[PDB]
């Protein structure tokens, strides 16, 4: 039995954060915890908040026994991007996209007979 948590509409650019996500996929919860603390990215914080909310979700609502779980699946999707005007030389005016993530961590229990 599995438990997941999704943070929707995070103001972070997916490419950036998908990076630390790949750093935890498949690892047990004990190291993934250790990995994000000492990982240096703005994305490391955010992924950790989802990671934890999913552990919390697991052990409470799903009766899953916190010491036996790993990160089964994790992935980040691209939520709606924020467009602001960027004034440019010679009256030019570009548009930068301040982008947005949907982070998903999914937890499952290590088989652990």
């Amino acid at each position: 039995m599995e438990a997941k948590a999704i943070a929707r509409y995070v103001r972070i650019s997916p490419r950036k954060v998908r990076l630390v996500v790949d750093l935890i996929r498949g690892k047990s919860l004990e190291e993934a915890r250790n990995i994000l603390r000492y990982t240096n990215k703005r994305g490391a914080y955010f992924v950790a908040k989802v990671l934890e909310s999913a552990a919390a979700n697991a052990v409470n609502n799903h009766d899953m026994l916190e010491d036996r779980l790993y990160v089964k699946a994790a992935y980040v999707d691209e939520g709606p991007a924020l467009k602001r005007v960027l004034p440019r030389a010679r009256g030019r005016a570009d548009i930068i996209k301040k982008r947005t993530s949907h982070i998903t961590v999914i937890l499952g229990e290590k088989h652990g007979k």
């Binding site: 000492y38 990982t39 240096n40």
Partner: protein, 49 residues
């Protein structure tokens, strides 16, 4: 100097191949000789230095 510009849009293949090096390396950690917790070497453990 005039104004170089990319001549073709990069294929999804050639950009993803570019990014073949971009993955990170998980930080390197030792078990803390005092506390239970994990810590990076040659450094003062965030719990009880």
């Amino acid at each position: 100097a005039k104004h170089p510009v990319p001549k073709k849009k990069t294929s999804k293949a050639r950009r993803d191949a570019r990014r073949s090096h971009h993955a990170l390396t998980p930080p390197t950690l030792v078990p803390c000789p005092e506390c239970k917790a994990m810590k990076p070497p040659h450094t003062v453990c965030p719990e009880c230095g």
